[PDB]
Amino acid sequence: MNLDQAEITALTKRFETPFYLYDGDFIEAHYRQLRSRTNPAIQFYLSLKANNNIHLAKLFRQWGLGVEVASAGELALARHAGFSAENIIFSGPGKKRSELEIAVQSGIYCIIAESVEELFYIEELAEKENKTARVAIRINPDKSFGSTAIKMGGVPRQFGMDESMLDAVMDAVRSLQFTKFIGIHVYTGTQNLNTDSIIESMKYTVDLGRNIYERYGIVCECINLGGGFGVPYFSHEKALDIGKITRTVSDYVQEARDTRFPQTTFIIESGRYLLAQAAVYVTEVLYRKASKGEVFVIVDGGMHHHAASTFSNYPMEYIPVREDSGRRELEKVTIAGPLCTPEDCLGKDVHVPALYPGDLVCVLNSGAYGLSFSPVHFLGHPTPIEILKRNGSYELIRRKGTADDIVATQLQ
Amino acid sequence: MNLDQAEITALTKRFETPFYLYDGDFIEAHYRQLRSRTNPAIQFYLSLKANNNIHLAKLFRQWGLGVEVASAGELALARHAGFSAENIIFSGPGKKRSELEIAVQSGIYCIIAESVEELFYIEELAEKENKTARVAIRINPDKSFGSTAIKMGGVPRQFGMDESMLDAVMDAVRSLQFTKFIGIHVYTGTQNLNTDSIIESMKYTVDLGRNIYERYGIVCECINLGGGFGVPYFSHEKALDIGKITRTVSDYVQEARDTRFPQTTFIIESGRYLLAQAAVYVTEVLYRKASKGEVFVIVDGGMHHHAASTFSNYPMEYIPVREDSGRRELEKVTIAGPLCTPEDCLGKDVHVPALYPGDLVCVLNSGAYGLSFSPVHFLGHPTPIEILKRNGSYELIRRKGTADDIVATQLQ
Ligand SMILES: *Cc1c(COP(=O)(O)O)cnc(C)c1O
Ligand SMILES: *Cc1c(COP(=O)(O)O)cnc(C)c1O
């Protein structure tokens, strides 16, 4: 997203730092560029865990994406955002029966089961609710992807069910009288910057769909290719070749649609790739000090709002505001937040133009795994404002937190 | 705290897992044993950041402790808990002017300043409010403590002001007409398991008080010795010799009271030591699976409630509940929570009696840096119930979270 320093300075007169600022024009253009390159039989699904703000999620709903939820709470958020039931899928390795109950009662597109015991729970709830529950299976492939792993055969994971267990899973599936099997899901992990490994895993997932037809005579109605598209945060990281991924997977999916899967919905999921680059976290320098030969710059935001930046260094931009100093030589500094813990460090030993109280530190690539990934109540600071810029206007999409927010669960 | 397995099983019939259970009888006995060993001129202060539950904090208030707050939000919590202004101190390296304003308006015992610029902000606010503001200074000693650091002279830190800057700080202090200097504070860091290093730092802090009298003619009314008393979490860790710390520091403080400091309040702060061992985090096994030669046990709680256990392994106790299996051989397993991320791991490669759905996993030493240290809204799961056992009765001290708690700041 392009950062306008005068725009950000102006916003800090209207909104108290620290805040997240989202470029909604970039969000839309970035999504549409991805969409335009991708076979129309593939539907994109937003992973809500990457950002729990319903006003951002509503944008993707309006553009036709589905949403992937991982809890009954995220299911509620998805409905606040206006996603229809036919565009909601439910993942996760530890769904409680009460969560399965709400999912069955909601009639969502599918619950992606991660164990045989889960399948039987779903069946029991479908019977009690007099519904046909739609289920997919999350498969942990018996193959490792990329050109760097040592051992063949895939990796031990708490997620889903080993591919080697498919016969037992399909035997269970086909015995469930109130449950309809609709397909499969493979997800190889987040922050994947290896273009070829992504292509390989998605092709492998289409091929698993073929294998299920060959072995069981079932044509998957939904094949969820996962994704995990990474975003570069550090200088040594390179962006994915999104052109190569979209072209190669689109062609592989088209060949499947032309043969065995003419009415199958293919899904690519994304959280980070859709949102990370669209936001900046803006924080004001409160104090500057020297300690034992080092310089420390203390800012008004930190780990309780943006934990991921705390634990290399995120990309950052600096806005000089203080009107009295012109003493802006490059220096090595540590940028620390306001928390009473040495872990609250946005940047250690970072080489910046000299930062003084009133200057702004802007943390880039902050749109995913930001506020909701952080220990928001640690040390009792107010949760931050979030602002959405779009179509030339600015909209408050999250109010500043209050102390009453902290004690709500305690008084009650 | 002693864990009664039948008690915990009975509680899970009344309260939905996952939950925190606090032994309030242990909290009181553990505190009173510490108090009894300590010179009465030392007052203990609870560090609220270790646990933000006001019902626990109220216990310490009733026993006469002070409270150390690190934000205006924690100041509000301290007042909910009934701490009087004369028993509240305010620390932190990044206090906003709005936080300083509320602290001045509240007339608290002192604001512990961490920069000269902070001192001037406080003075300006005291003038505007027509109050005398009480301030202490946080000093970063020019000495390293223990018998393991290489370089002499102390360590670069974002906290407080280097001891070498004392003349400049005292020159600033003495120029503030609406602010009263009341003393000093040294805090060397959390989870300190080195008995002698604690004794050395506390003695050094008393000696700094003497140095301030010798150099400036000022008798500190408050000398805050900090603390950071650690608690052993892992098998290789040894408990502090609390007897040695309390006896040696009490004697050193008594010598100061008998000579130069007859009316000085000495403070020892504690969060972790007062609370860590008093709680268990109880979580139910939802699913069990094999993946690629390993066993995974998925529980209903995890990183979003108790991040510290996720990133060795905390001490854990296991309660067999499932009534059908007797297949309890020792096995190596990974215990994972319900979140859609491999980081949600309570125990990797841990050797336990075989765990089956319905069994309970109890994470010990969970009373400090627990719920409020965790990304409670990540993935949208309800925040957990907290229960206080005391005097033979059980009290709900935090209700289960709801989806409305997540969206409150977004709708509004
Ligand atoms: C985490 C998650 C996603 C989103 O991952 P990103 O790397 O943010 O795109 C997609 N699918 C599943 C199953 C997930 O758990
Ligand atoms: C963190 C903190 C404490 C509490 O530390 P514990 O190790 O939990 O006892 C005390 N004083 C200050 C200044 C702190 O920042």
Swiss-Prot record, chains A, B:
Coiled coil: none annotated. It comes from the Bacteria. It catalyses: gamma-L-glutamyl-[BtrI ACP] + H(+) = 4-aminobutanoyl-[BtrI ACP] + CO2. The modification N6-(pyridoxal phosphate)lysine is found at residue 49. Pfam families: Orn_Arg_deC_N, Orn_DAP_Arg_deC. Its EC number is 4.1.1.95. One of its GO terms (molecular function) is carboxy-lyase activity. Its cofactor is pyridoxal 5'-phosphate. SUPFAM superfamilies: Alanine racemase C-terminal domain-like, PLP-binding barrel. Belongs to the Orn/Lys/Arg decarboxylase class-II family. Pyridoxal phosphate-dependent decarboxylase that catalyzes 1 step in the biosynthesis of the side chain of the aminoglycoside antibiotics in the biosynthetic pathway of butirosin. Able to decarboxylate L-ornithine, L-arginine, L-lysine, but not L-glutamate or any D-amino acids. Has low activity with substrates not bound to an acyl-carrier protein. Homodimer. This is L-glutamyl-[BtrI acyl-carrier protein] decarboxylase. It comes from Niallia circulans. The gene is btrK.
